[PDB]
């Protein structure tokens, strides 16, 4: 890897045939500064604090996506139509902060070594799907050109109140349920 | 078994060392997970990284406008964004929370801090402990905070006081938490 004090991606441009779909983000020292919602064609912030560090003209992202679609067709041909390898992701679940019963906290489901960037991440509480209080990052880049993605579940710790992060990915043989308990 | 996928990645990567004393742009062109072509501002031209990048490297290097534009992105992207965003982000500070819990073992959990530079020391009474201290890696939470856990193997006498001691750029002086 290149040695440097700080590293930014300006930006991470993803485009894939499945869908097809794309992603446009900027990263600084490994965190997501902003993204472009390509459906609404607007710059947005998963972490709105960082809107203070300047905006972005979404048309740049849209132009890049048009060029990427073109380039992808050409590279598929140059590589004999070799399909992406489905790597095996690794899933880790942990709390953001020390756990006190009845004190609001956040569960973090880290899905690492993702490729291709296609994944279902859902939360189960005592075996039942949770939808409220769930958010997730973009596909965050890695130097080996795989991705990680993190899902968050705000929750209230309580006794006999247990969780699973359920991950579906084509490189798994079955959905992966990673357990966590207070 | 699974659906087929074909992925393209383009990465416009900016590297900064010593403030902006050294700035370097590397644009990476990737098929699936294979980088096949790249532009390195330290080199000034495109290079094929795999044979499949050779058509582009030759083509792109023959277009004066392409070379001029890409070369200018060291200024219009990297230096520009450092002025617009990264200097400020580098001024960002989020103080760590420090909690001790027993397990003989003591666990000092240091959570919810930014940036990632941090130092955690364990003390037994008035002596820093080095043997028997083991740490996790820095853990990235994804929400612009880190955490880390630092464990101390202990054989506690009653009256011994253990101190977890945390230095971080957000702090005028270290945080100290005590366990008796």
């Amino acid at each position: 890897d290149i040695v440097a004090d700080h590293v930014a991606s300006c930006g991470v441009n993803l485009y894939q045939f499945y869908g097809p779909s794309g992603q446009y983000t900027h990263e600084f020292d490994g965190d997501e500064q902003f993204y472009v919602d390509l459906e609404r064609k607007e710059t947005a912030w998963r972490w709105p604090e960082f809107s203070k560090f300047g905006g972005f003209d979404p048309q740049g992202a849209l132009r890049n996506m048009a060029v990427a679609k073109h380039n992808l067709n050409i590279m598929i041909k140059r590589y004999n139509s070799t399909a992406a390898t489905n790597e095996v992701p690794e899933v880790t679940v942990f709390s953001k902060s020390p756990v006190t019963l009845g004190q609001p906290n956040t569960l973090i489901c880290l899905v690492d070594n993702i490729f291709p960037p296609v994944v279902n991440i859902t939360w189960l509480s005592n075996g039942q799907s949770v939808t409220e209080g769930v958010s997730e990052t973009s596909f965050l880049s890695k130097s080996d050109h795989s991705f990680f993605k993190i899902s968050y579940l705000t929750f209230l710790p309580s006794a006999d109140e247990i969780y699973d992060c359920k991950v579906e990915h084509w490189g798994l043989d079955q959905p992966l349920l990673k357990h966590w308990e207070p | 078994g699974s659906p087929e996928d074909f992925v393209f990645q383009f990465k416009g990567m900016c590297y900064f060392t010593n403030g902006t004393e050294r700035v370097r742009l590397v644009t990476r062109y990737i098929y699936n997970r294979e980088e096949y072509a790249r532009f390195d501002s330290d080199v000034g031209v495109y290079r094929a990284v795999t044979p499949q990048g050779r058509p582009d490297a030759e083509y792109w290097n023959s277009q004066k406008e392409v070379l001029e534009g890409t070369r200018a992105e060291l200024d219009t992207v990297c230096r520009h964004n450092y002025e617009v965003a990264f200097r400020g982000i580098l001024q960002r500070r989020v103080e760590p929370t420090v909690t001790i819990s027993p397990s003989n073992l003591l666990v000092c959990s240091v959570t919810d801090f930014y940036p990632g530079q941090i130092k955690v020391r364990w003390f037994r009474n008035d002596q820093e402990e080095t043997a028997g201290v083991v740490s996790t890696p820095l853990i990235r939470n994804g929400d612009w905070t880190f955490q880390i856990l630092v464990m101390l193997e202990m054989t506690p006498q009653r009256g011994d006081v253990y101190t977890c001691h945390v230095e971080h750029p957000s702090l005028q002086s270290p945080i100290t938490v005590e366990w008796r």
Binding site: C10, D57 | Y59
Partner: peptide, 20 residues
């Protein structure tokens, strides 16, 4: 006042292909 992004260059095209 705005962040700028690196632009993707348009690949050379028109190559043939082989079916796997």
């Amino acid at each position: 006042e705005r962040n700028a992004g690196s632009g993707i260059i348009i690949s050379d095209g028109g190559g043939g292909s082989l079916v796997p």
